Amino acid sequence: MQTLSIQHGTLVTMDQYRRVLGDSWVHVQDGRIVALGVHAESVPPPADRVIDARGKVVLPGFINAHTHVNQILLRGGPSHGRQFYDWLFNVVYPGQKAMRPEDVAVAVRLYCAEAVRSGITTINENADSAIYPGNIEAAMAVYGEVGVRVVYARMFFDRMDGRIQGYVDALKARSPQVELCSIMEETAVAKDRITALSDQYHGTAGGRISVWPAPATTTAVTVEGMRWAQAFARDRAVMWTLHMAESDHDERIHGMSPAEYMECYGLLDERLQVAHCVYFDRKDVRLLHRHNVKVASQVVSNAYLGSGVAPVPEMVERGMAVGIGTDNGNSNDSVNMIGDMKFMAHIHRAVHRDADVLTPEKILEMATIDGARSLGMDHEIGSIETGKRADLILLDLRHPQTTPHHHLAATIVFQAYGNEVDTVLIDGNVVMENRRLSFLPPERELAFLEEAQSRATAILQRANMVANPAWRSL
């Protein structure tokens, strides 16, 4: 039994009573939070190592409820300015295709480096490139080494959407030299591939890695395919996830909303996590609420791609589990939970013309405990409580931007930039300490970033994509 003691911190527990514990400590053992206490009232147990958190804030690790990792190598100029499908077919698919396994490994490490730096400890990777050979293995090796907690949601597409062909062909003419790609696969092939992947990797890296099935959308997946995924999630006590209504061209499947359609086939349940709820109406919300569907809101990305604004307050006010996702590494274009929290707070205040539509406490909940709920993992993660995993982060507010600070949630949401996280523990392991990354040490950092830059450039050459378009004011 390895042990760790975090001492003299202010504990923002996000526990049942939302306790905030001044000058207090956390005892960790074998990856689990085993006890907590107040220093004035109790003495911490002896431990192999002590981390002094004096003058620091301790939080549960942030949870990235829905993201796409590999695409991070496509940010920096190629990705912006485009509506969802334009982005998807002229950038994302062709760019992903051009990526070799050694490229994917770098992307994953880069993504993880930025994520951990910003306090993110759990990542729901929606993987659209798992169809390409060697990619999975390359990625999983890095996830495991790095020590992050990962849900690997293996996306599949088993159905052509014939309605949208002419639209796509027209979009492709924008970059006619980038190649029109298809990642469709037969239903049975997808089942086999995902089942294999689950059998092999689910529970690996010390319980840190999970595998879920991810039918892509209601228009790109058959009923048979979604029913399988639903059944799979139930049989294996995990979740399934689906992208739902992310553009106005998806808004309507068979004369009804995607939620309506899913309801018709008995496809809304408590183990479903839907992502992207922009094109939702009152009824869609009601249906999701009725069946206890979990939600991931990609607020920044919904803006970036010009989709719009989801009805998060409406869902939250009904006690639904809504987490925050950064979305793609190239539809954001950061991996920074704090920046996105700020954005979640502000965009909804602005649109509702209501300064109190979401409290910063609530936003912080979305990033932590509620996010865990949306992953069906709230029993294991999301709060500083005895029994739960030691996924913990230490923030230093001793900086200009976060001075003064009194109310910690307000300070974090409205002031912090994302560089104030100091130490990060995942499953009891020290992944980052005084901003030094265990899986990317400072003496190796600059060289690694140069490798990532190069590979990115090369990827874009191979895909025939324009990296740096001409200066454009309008």
Next chain:
Amino acid sequence: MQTLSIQHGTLVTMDQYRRVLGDSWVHVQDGRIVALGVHAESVPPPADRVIDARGKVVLPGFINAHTHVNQILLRGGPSHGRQFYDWLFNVVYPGQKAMRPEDVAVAVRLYCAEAVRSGITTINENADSAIYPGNIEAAMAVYGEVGVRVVYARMFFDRMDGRIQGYVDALKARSPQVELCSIMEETAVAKDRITALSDQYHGTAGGRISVWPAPATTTAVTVEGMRWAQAFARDRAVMWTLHMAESDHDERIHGMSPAEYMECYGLLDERLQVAHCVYFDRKDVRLLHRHNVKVASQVVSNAYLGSGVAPVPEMVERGMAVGIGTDNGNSNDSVNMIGDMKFMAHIHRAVHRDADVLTPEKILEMATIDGARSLGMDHEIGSIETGKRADLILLDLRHPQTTPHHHLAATIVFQAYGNEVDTVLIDGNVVMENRRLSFLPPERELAFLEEAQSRATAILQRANMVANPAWRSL
């Protein structure tokens, strides 16, 4: 300890599990439901009297969450076609003024007759005519005799709204021969009068009568007045109630919504029941939700007076306690919970373009258990559960309109007219049996109705109100 056994009925319990118990019985003692059972599994206890409910449906008594009784003598021609304030100042105030105590007694008995006939067992009387001498006394005598459960919410006005004077003078010119009335009173006078009324009548008639304070509106009552009412409710373990935002001329007090205004002064709490939520926005709903404010929706009246349509589904979807009120006897113009339930179901389906916005089950809950909640009385009434008061109603569905019937809530909401109620018990006492009213026997009924007709006619003469306006198609 007197006893009553209701047998061989189908029990629609509205209990914690929404149990519907076929061929089942209820045992009543000293006004309280002491046991329930299924006939096939168990034998009912011996009892002084048995009521055979064979082929009948047993429900908790309907709860009229917000109403105004006396005005019932002003229905039948004088009251319709007018916006809220036009109705208020040219019909309601002058008409009420013209009523003598002997008239009020008749009004109350007529109202109660109709109410009990339609299954209503609890009544939240918002009394705007309590200021006139002898009226309280007359009314209370009848409520007590009749055996209905009554909340007597004594309304007061201690503040002139100078902003709407010109509007009202213009409205008065519609019926210039009808006198402009004021029922304003000094803050201290109102406190004293209400406190006296409470001391005298609260808990009387075997616990069946309660007294609450009812500041009329946020524009017609001082902050000092509302705070007093709030404190009073707290100190005496009752509720306080307030009319909120019933017309577009109210929709703003001091540059903010009434709910916003109340929030500013700490005036929203869990003992508050607001009525009339038509001019409500998302933020108002949120505020009421935050503080667990109870609500009464007067759906039919909101239509009758041309106010509009309240966001009931939005409040209900947030688990708020929303009851159904019939409102004024002369802004409906019935006292029929079943008819109003039907209207609640349909108006919202039509406006939301959604056939399932409110299930008939949910509508039925609004009329019973949820209604009880909205009165702060859900521990005592609203469901067929052991420990609760024996406020119970028997419905006979053996009629053409309610045939066929399978799903009982659907049948009651979408088919029943309101004449299907047979036997009614309030606090264990039999108040109607086989449509015979204990407090208005059939051999006396016709003569009583002729007395009510006469007195009504006379009231209108005295108030100089037009009873029967000329035929008008446009």
